[PDB]
Amino acid sequence: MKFTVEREHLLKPLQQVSGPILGNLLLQVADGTLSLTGTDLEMEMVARVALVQPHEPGATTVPARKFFDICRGLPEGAEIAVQLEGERMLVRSGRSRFSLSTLPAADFPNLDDWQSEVEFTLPQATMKRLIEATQFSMAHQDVRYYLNGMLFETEGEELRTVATDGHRLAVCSMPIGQSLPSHSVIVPRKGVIELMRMLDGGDNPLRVQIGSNNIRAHVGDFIFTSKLVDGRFPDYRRVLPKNPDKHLEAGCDLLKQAFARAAILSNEKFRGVRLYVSENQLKITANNPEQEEAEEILDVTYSGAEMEIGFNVSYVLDVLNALKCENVRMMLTDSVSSVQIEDAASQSAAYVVMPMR
Amino acid sequence: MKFTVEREHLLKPLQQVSILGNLLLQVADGTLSLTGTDLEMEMVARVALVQPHEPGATTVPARKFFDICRGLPEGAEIAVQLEGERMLVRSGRSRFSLSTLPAADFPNLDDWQSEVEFTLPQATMKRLIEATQFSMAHQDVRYYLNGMLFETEGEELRTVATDGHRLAVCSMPIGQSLPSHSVIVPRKGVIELMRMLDGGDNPLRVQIGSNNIRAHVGDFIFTSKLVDGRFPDYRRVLPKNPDKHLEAGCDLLKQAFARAAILSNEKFRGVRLYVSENQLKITANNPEQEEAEEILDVTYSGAEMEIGFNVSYVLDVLNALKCENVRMMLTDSVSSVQIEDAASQSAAYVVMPMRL
Amino acid sequence: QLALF
Ligand SMILES: [Ca+2]
Ligand SMILES: [Ca+2]
Ligand SMILES: [Ca+2]
Ligand SMILES: [Ca+2]
Ligand SMILES: [Ca+2]
Ligand SMILES: [Cl-]
User: Can you tell me which residues the record assigns to a coiled coil (chain A)?
Assistant: First the structure.
């Protein structure tokens, strides 16, 4: 195995695949392509780098971070000549020379084979929107494993992401212009993080394939495959207020800063704040075990009946931070029902937060 | 106690001064003073009151008061008054009520006399501390190592830091005659002195007593206890007449050592230098028998020699230097190495040799 | 804190 490749053509692929043999990258020269693979047994990332310079076929496994560090550590425009010799991988560039340990390619684990059942193409920017709109609402380490992940749902010509932790929910829907079957899968959060990281911001489309226990996304020269999660994901339709008689509108940043200040004097553990809505007015209050108090009064557009309702303020703040927009619409029922929060100018995403008593 | 002050006139003072979790606030003679303390050291900040105000004093949670003020909109008039056991903070349509503790319980550092004094530019003090700070020990039982020597001699101020393994020294002339005197400033004191300095045009006044130090800049006053101990002698650590001088681009040498570091022992970080005519070769190996080699052009004309050292120590020095060219003053394989900016002798760094 | 579901 021998190849010579420019630093900049190696860095991005290396970064993508890098994030005992599990600590190594499988390298393969075959058919004029170098392929770099990393895996944690649950998911797998593959990068394909065309080899334009002379090269010899073969496969090995090298420590992931050390090899990435060497290449990144090399000067801008460095040519990185690499060859297997005995039990070692030699890496050379200018007068920099490195000899890395290896493990047999034979020992590198392969994920089981599977069959694609649902497929679709979408702009990269669409997948970026879908994930960034919802990611933060995933549970962290809930004993309900299906909540530590993101629902990816197809319906009609829309792909939809949903995330909830049982107290708050995010949902986002985007048209992709293809006749899709009705279907749902749960991608574990680690897969979601990786899928988000492979989106370079370029105009290269993404290709999604969904199996019965797997999901695969192809963009450019990268192929990411992850296992899915078991269990019954909740239905976001149940969660959206069936009918809202109470509509609030306010600037996102004003609301954010008011809530952020009130957060200061909220209970450290429970984070509770009270909301008082009345004719064109929102009042936010907070207090902690030390009987310290915060009060915020804001001009809003609000026409319904007066009501008071409590929240975990970090749940509200997460929502407003995730809305990168001028105006926020809030839709209410009563003091003990969930609230729906949206961008005033766009219904693409909706955020639902259950109150505190 | 009453005052109303623009947000941006409170933020820097609050930043600097942040019951030991409370700030003391005093309104006297047209000035608001803010004090923060951990019992070892103290920061006092003054702000002039152009708006209507009433005298008095109280203490208020530091982080919460800070957070609220920073939380408020750009250019906010912050009105403050004492009301019972509570302090009221008002601005626009925002209102806050913070718990207070009595001003009379707020702890003062003991009174002391100044014995040596001098004024110097901020940038000079900042250069002295920055060049050496990283070589201070962190919580060594040799308690005197957990801080920085401040030595006056002739017309210069000098800082020395060492952790028992590597040394940093920096000397700067300050244009005043000084007695020969040395003190140790606690590491937290050093860090706090450092960030009190914006490097701006306000001169820094230093006052040293037998057990205390004080730095005066513009509206801010820092005071610290000194470390009551005996610092090691830096003169004893510096290599005697090093006759072998290598010069190389600082960045090229740093990048070579950084790549080589990757295959060095994770615990002991030993790398080897082979020096020959206008050339340096760096080698590293780990217990897994992985190997790194770097060769680069340099300016060198002395006797061929080998030497090893801790690459983390050298990387630290090279990062601190951030210059064009570095000078490595070498003796032999059994001797320390002195590193300097090739263009300045004002800062020097000593790394011990390793037999690898 | 109430449960969403
Ligand atoms: Ca092979
Ligand atoms: Ca939707
Ligand atoms: Ca509350
Ligand atoms: Ca302003
Ligand atoms: Ca070698
Ligand atoms: Cl030493």
Answer: none
